[PDB]
Enzyme design. Structure first.
Site, short mmCIF file in Angstrom:
data_model
loop_
_atom_site.label_atom_id
_atom_site.label_comp_id
_atom_site.label_asym_id
_atom_site.label_seq_id
_atom_site.Cartn_x
_atom_site.Cartn_y
_atom_site.Cartn_z
N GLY A 177 6.45 54.96 -23.34
CA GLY A 177 7.16 54.70 -22.10
C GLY A 177 8.64 55.00 -22.12
N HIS B 247 6.19 66.46 -18.58
CA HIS B 247 4.87 66.02 -19.01
C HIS B 247 4.39 64.79 -18.27
CE1 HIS B 247 7.14 63.58 -22.17
NE2 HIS B 247 6.34 62.67 -21.64
N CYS C 227 10.12 57.94 -22.65
CA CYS C 227 10.52 59.29 -22.26
C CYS C 227 11.32 59.25 -20.96
CB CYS C 227 9.30 60.20 -22.10
SG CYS C 227 8.60 60.59 -23.69
#
Ligand SMILES: *C(=N)[C@H](C[C@@H]1CCNC1=O)NC(=O)[C@@H]1Cc2ccccc2CN1C(=O)[C@@H](NC(=O)C(F)(F)F)C(C)(C)C
Ligand SMILES: *C(=N)[C@H](C[C@@H]1CCNC1=O)NC(=O)[C@@H]1Cc2ccccc2CN1C(=O)[C@@H](NC(=O)C(F)(F)F)C(C)(C)C
Ligand code: NA
Ligand code: NA
Lengths: 306, 306
Positions: free
Chosen positions: A143, A41, A145
C-alpha cells in the site's frame, strides 16, 4: 551540537497526498494543481503482473474507473493519461494546498526525504539516499506505492522519487515524477535484482567533516595522499571513485575545518585499512554515506568546535 | 521491508511555530489557540545568566516588550505569565492551524520527533529518545530553543518536549510543555553535567524483534534465561533493568515472531557477551535502543518474513 539523520519538514507534501483506487487496487497519489500523479500499476490485476501491456490495459479504462479521495472528499477524475510509468489523473479540483514545486531527477549519491503513506494518509518521514545501484534503502509495506521523496529549498518542494517496487533484498525501486525508473528496474513481476552497490565516497568524507565540526578529530592523521592513490584504495574497498568535482564540492567544508580534502582522504584511507578499533564517529560504528556535503552544511554549525 | 529512524509527519506542528523576541534575544515559540509557549530565558540578558531571578526579570517587562511573529505577520501580546520554565504569551489571534493536541510528560526510554526550528521557521525533523539520564541526543544550534518534540496519535499531537539547553557533552536538556525540566537540569549557566547514561534494554529487544520481522535470525540462539539472570548480565553492561512490565509490553512482538521474550533476552545476552563479530543488524553495527516496542509495531509489517 549533535548530528542526526534529518529529514525536511513534511507539511507541504502532506497536503498533497491522496488515495487512488482502480478496481481492487488502492495506493497513494500526489495531488498538485488539478492533476494527481500515481504509479501506473494501479490499473493492473493479479493474474497479469508478469508482463502487463499498460497501453492495452489503460485504453480499457474510463475516467470513472478511477476513484480519488482527498481526506474524506471524493475528487472526480475528468481526464487521464500515461507518461512513462506514472498515470496523470486530471481532477475537477485544484489542490488549494499546492506548494511551490519542481520535479527533479536526482543523481546517485543524492539524498532526499520520504513521506511514507498508506491509503492517502501520511505515516512517517525518514531520510534516504539514491544508492549508486539506483535502489533506495527505504521502509515500505503493501500500500505504500505512490509515496514520494523530496527535498525542500527555501519554499520550493523538489519532488524526486515516487515509490513503485520492492526487490528481493528488501530494497526499493521507483521513478522520478515523470515516471522514469531509476536504474534498470521495471514495473513487471520478473526476476530483477539490485546490482552490486558501492559506498558513496564524497558523502563519507562530508560526514567526517561533520564529525570535526562537532568537535572530534581522533581519526585524523598527519598524512596526505594524491587523488589517484586514494582512488586506488577506494576501489579496493568498494567505494565510488572520488572526482575532482567532488573535491571542489567539499571545498566549503574543507575551508571551515582547515583540513584539506586530500588530507581528509588520507584519514579515510587509514580508517578503511585499520577500521575504527572499537571507536565511534558521530555515534556510528560504521562509516556513514547518506549525508551529502549540502546536508552537512545544512545541519551543522558554521563555526567549528576547535 | 526496511527499517528506518522514522519521525512523525511534522505538518501539524509546522503550522504552530512562531518567532519570539525579547530585547536582543530571539528564539522559537509554539502557538496553540491564543497562547504562545516559549522558554522563559528569552527574557534574560548576557550578564545575568549565572543565576537569573526570573520573577524579578519578568515583573519589569510589559506585554509590548515581547514581539511575536508568525510568518510575516506580527501577533500582538495581550497578556503574559510564567509557568515553571516556560512563558505563556497571550496573543490577540487564535492560531487557525491549531491541531488537536495534548501536553504529555514522557518517561525515560520513550521516543519522540523533534521539529528543529530557527527564527520561527522549521528546519528539519528527526527522531530522538528521552535517555535514562533525562538528556536527549538532539541536533540543535544557537536559536533553536523553543523547538518542540512530539508524538502523533491518530489526529492528536502530543507535545512532550521544548528545547532549552546544551550540556558540555553536546547533549540536550529541556522541559515538558508545562515548563518542568526533564532531569536535574536548570535554566542557569552553571556547571551541569549529564549523569551516567544507560542503554534502554526494552528498546534493544524491540529492535531485535524488528530484525526478525524483517527476515533476519542470525543472532538468535537455542538458550533461554530467567529474568533475574538476564538482569544480572544487563547491569554488567550498563543496561537498564528489564521489568515484568517490559516483558508484558513486548508481548505482541513476541507473539508475532514466535520468540518468547526471555528467549530474546538470551539472544541479547549472547550479543553483549560475544559482540556482533563483524555482522550488522538492520544495517547497524551497534545495538540500537531508540526504537520503542510501539515504534516497531508502527513501522514494521504485521506479517513476519519467515
Ligand atoms: C506498492 N504499493 C508496492 C510496494 C511494495 C510492497 C512490499 N514493499 C514494497 O515496497 N509495490 C508492489 O507491490 C509492486 C507492484 C507491481 C507492479 C507491477 C508488477 C508487479 C508488482 C508487484 N510489486 C513488487 O514490488 C514485487 N516486487 C517485484 O516484483 C520485483 F522484485 F521488483 F521484481 C513484490 C514486492 C514481490 C510484490
Ligand atoms: C537556545 N536557543 C539555546 C540552544 C543551545 C545553543 C547551542 N546548542 C543548543 O542547544 N540555549 C542556550 O543557549 C541556553 C540558554 C540559557 C538560559 C539560561 C542560562 C544560560 C543559558 C545558555 N544556554 C546553554 O545552553 C549553555 N549551556 C549551559 O549553560 C549548560 F551547559 F546547560 F549548563 C551554553 C550551550 C554553554 C550556551
Ligand atoms: Na589526515
Ligand atoms: Na534465543
Amino acid at each position: 551540537s549533535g548530528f542526526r539523520k534529518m529529514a525536511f519538514p513534511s507539511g507541504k507534501v502532506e497536503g498533497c497526498m491522496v488515495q487512488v483506487t482502480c478496481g481492487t487496487t488502492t495506493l497513494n497519489g500526489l495531488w498538485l494543481d488539478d492533476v494527481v500523479y500515481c504509479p501506473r500499476h494501479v490499473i493492473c490485476t493479479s493474474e497479469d503482473m508478469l508482463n502487463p501491456n499498460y497501453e492495452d490495459l489503460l485504453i480499457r479504462k474510463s475516467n470513472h474507473n478511477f476513484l480519488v479521495q482527498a481526506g474524506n472528499v471524493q475528487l472526480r477524475v475528468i481526464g487521464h493519461s500515461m507518461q512513462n510509468c506514472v498515470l496523470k489523473l486530471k481532477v475537477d479540483t485544484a489542490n488549494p494546498k499546492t506548494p511551490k514545486y519542481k520535479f527533479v531527477r536526482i543523481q546517485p549519491g543524492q539524498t532526499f526525504s520520504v513521506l511514507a503513506c498508506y491509503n492517502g494518509s501520511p505515516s512517517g518521514v525518514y531520510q534516504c539516499a539514491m544508492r549508486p545501484n539506483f535502489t533506495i534503502k527505504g521502509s515500505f509495506l503493501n500500500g505504500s506505492c505512490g509515496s514520494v521523496g523530496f527535498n525542500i529549498d527555501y519554499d520550493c518542494v523538489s519532488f524526486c522519487y515516487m515509490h513503485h517496487m520492492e526487490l528481493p533484498t528488501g530494497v526499493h525501486a521507483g521513478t522520478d515524477l515523470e515516471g522514469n525508473f531509476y536504474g534498470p528496474f521495471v514495473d513487471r513481476q520478473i526476476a530483477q535484482a539490485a546490482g552490486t552497490d558501492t559506498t558513496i565516497t564524497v558523502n563519507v568524507l562530508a560526514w567526517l567533516y561533520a564529525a570535526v565540526i562537532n568537535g572530534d578529530r581522533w581519526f585524523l592523521n598527519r598524512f596526505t595522499t594524491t587523488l589517484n592513490d586514494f582512488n586506488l584504495v577506494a576501489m579496493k574497498y568498494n567505494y565510488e571513485p572520488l572526482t575532482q568535482d567532488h573535491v571542489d564540492i567539499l571545498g566549503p567544508l574543507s575551508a571551515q575545518t582547515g583540513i584539506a580534502v586530500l588530507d581528509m582522504c588520507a584519514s579515510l584511507k587509514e580508517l578503511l585499512q585499520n577500521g575504527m578499533n572499537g571507536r565511534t564517529i558521530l555515534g556510528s560504528a560504521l562509516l556513514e554515506d547518506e549525508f551529502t556535503p549540502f546536508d552537512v552544511v545544512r545541519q551543522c554549525s558554521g563555526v567549528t568546535f576547535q
